[PDB]
Amino acid sequence: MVSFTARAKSNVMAYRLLAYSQGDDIIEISHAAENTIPDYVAVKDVDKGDLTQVNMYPLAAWQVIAGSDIKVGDNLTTGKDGTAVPTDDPSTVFGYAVEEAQEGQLVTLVIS
């Protein structure tokens, strides 16, 4: 994979959808805003001032926290706190569920 250094700027939690921004000579990361398309997924807790890395790779699927109950095949978007939630507005869809998840459980997703 291709790794690079990035700094959290707002208490990154594991399995949350992440977004990024241009900071002080470094890419800064945080939980993705509600109702959008995320760029990266957390797989480690990284606090507000903590420095970490990002492992680049065209992953087939992500495992993220379900922000609500999810049915197999549901199109997903970002929700509160960077969780993944069911939707129906194409422009905010970043992937879809291949398995059932209850709120708070991990849900595997396939990118689109």
Binding site: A14, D45, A101, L106, V107
Partner: peptide, 9 residues
């Protein structure tokens, strides 16, 4: 401690 979660299966 951290965001350890489990899959639905």
């Amino acid at each position: 401690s951290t965001g350890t979660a489990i899959t639905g299966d």
